[PDB]
């Protein structure tokens, strides 16, 4: 029962066995488990070929609910502003849970400038997120190195508007102006201009530039532990055989 256990490991992938119970049911059904286990390594290599080829970088989170429910990746806002005031004011509990976190955030995730908050995401290697306005996030994502990105839908509807003083008669033709230009996509053409055509990246032009290569040493090196752990087994079974000597 201990002799042919190695010959089941000798039937595990390869290495044709020397002891063969020639043609009875142990020969046939011993081939049946043998037939089964060769499918498992065949699907292994096919799936491993797909992972090395396509290389899609899975984004970790989508929503602010995802940042609230975890604590691995830190997240901050500016050290002053309506955005910090918003979580301080928002009585929705998910926004309040984030503001519960940001008040208890030690060290302070609140950064002084926006450009500091851009690089601090880049410096902390993904484990510091940052919250800023959507259209400015649209712009900084297009500027090189283009290593930051906007994920998820926006938290709230806000709108920039053209401002005239109160009671000025200029605002109503401007009110007819903006609702005309937005209807014709004149804003959208300029939004294509000053975000994408003036952007230092094309986000799909950089999406059309992803072609990688050879396997690193890093996948092998964790498998050295089961090698050396078997090498520690080589003496312990041998030294008790010296006690059998």
């Amino acid at each position: 029962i201990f002799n042919s256990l190695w010959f089941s490991l000798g039937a595990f992938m390869q290495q044709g066995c020397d002891i063969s119970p020639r043609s009875l049911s142990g020969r046939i059904v011993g081939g049946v488990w043998w037939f089964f286990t060769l499918i498992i390594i065949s699907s292994y290599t096919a799936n491993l070929a797909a992972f090395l080829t396509v290389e899609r970088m899975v984004s970790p989170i989508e929503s602010a609910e995802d940042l609230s429910k975890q604590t691995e990746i830190a997240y901050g806002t500016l050290d002053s502003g309506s955005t910090k005031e918003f979580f301080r004011r928002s009585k929705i509990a998910v926004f309040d849970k984030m503001w519960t976190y940001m008040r208890s955030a030690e060290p302070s995730v609140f950064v002084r400038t926006t450009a500091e908050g851009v690089a601090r995401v880049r410096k902390s290697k993904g484990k510091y997120a940052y919250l800023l306005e959507s259209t400015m996030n649209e712009y900084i994502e297009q500027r090189k190195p283009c290593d930051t990105m906007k994920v998820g839908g926006n938290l709230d509807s806000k709108g920039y508007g053209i401002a005239t003083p109160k009671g000025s008669s200029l605002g109503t033709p401007v009110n007819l102006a903006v609702l005309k230009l937005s209807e014709q996509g004149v804003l959208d053409k300029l939004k294509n201009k000053w975000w994408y055509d003036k952007g230092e990246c094309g986000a799909k032009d950089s999406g059309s530039k992803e072609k990688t290569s050879a396997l690193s040493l890093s996948n092998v090196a964790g498998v050295f532990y089961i090698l050396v752990g078997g090498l520690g087994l080589a003496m312990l079974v041998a030294l008790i055989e010296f006690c059998y000597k």
Binding site: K125, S216, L217, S218, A221, F224, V228, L231, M235
Partner: protein
């Protein structure tokens, strides 16, 4: 002996790689050791135990695995000098002496493999201002690779005396 000499030559590595930042800044030459980073203006610093925070935790276990590689090489001579105490049970000690020399390099190759795992990850960081267009390994670290086979060629002849 020859396995021990080029093992500590990895400990006395004064150039782990060339360092080239010849960027048209200007021309730069670095010669970082296994621990101590020299460079060439002629100057030499340490630059040991760099970032971030879990690669440092690798470097805690890396230095321990460097120590355990050198200690077990000492165990080989001490029992073979007890053989010359009896050359002037015997086979029990010399068989034990080849165990620790084999278990030296098995620890030591991983110690040599963790520090390459240190080196490859930190170049993927692009080390804070010293990222070379080298990565030409060793040269004594390539000579440290020959210390392992000289631990293996030492063991095949002393188990050959164990069979008789």
């Amino acid at each position: 002996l020859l396995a021990l000499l080029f093992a500590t030559t990895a400990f006395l590595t004064t150039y782990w790689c060339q360092g080239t930042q010849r960027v048209p800044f200007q021309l730069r030459r670095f010669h970082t050791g296994i621990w101590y980073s020299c460079e060439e203006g002629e100057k030499c610093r340490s630059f040991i135990d760099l970032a971030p925070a879990s690669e440092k935790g690798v470097l805690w276990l890396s230095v321990v695995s460097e120590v355990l590689y050198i200690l077990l090489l000492v165990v080989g001579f001490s029992l073979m000098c007890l053989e010359l105490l009896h050359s002037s049970d015997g086979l029990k000690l010399n068989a034990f002496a080849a165990v620790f020399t084999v278990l030296s390099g098995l620890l030591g190759m991983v110690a040599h493999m963790m520090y390459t795992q240190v080196f490859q990850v930190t170049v993927s960081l692009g080390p804070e201002d010293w990222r070379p267009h080298s990565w030409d390994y060793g040269w004594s670290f390539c000579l440290a690779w020959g210390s392992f086979t000289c631990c293996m060629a030492a063991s095949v002849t002393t188990l050959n005396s164990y069979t008789k």
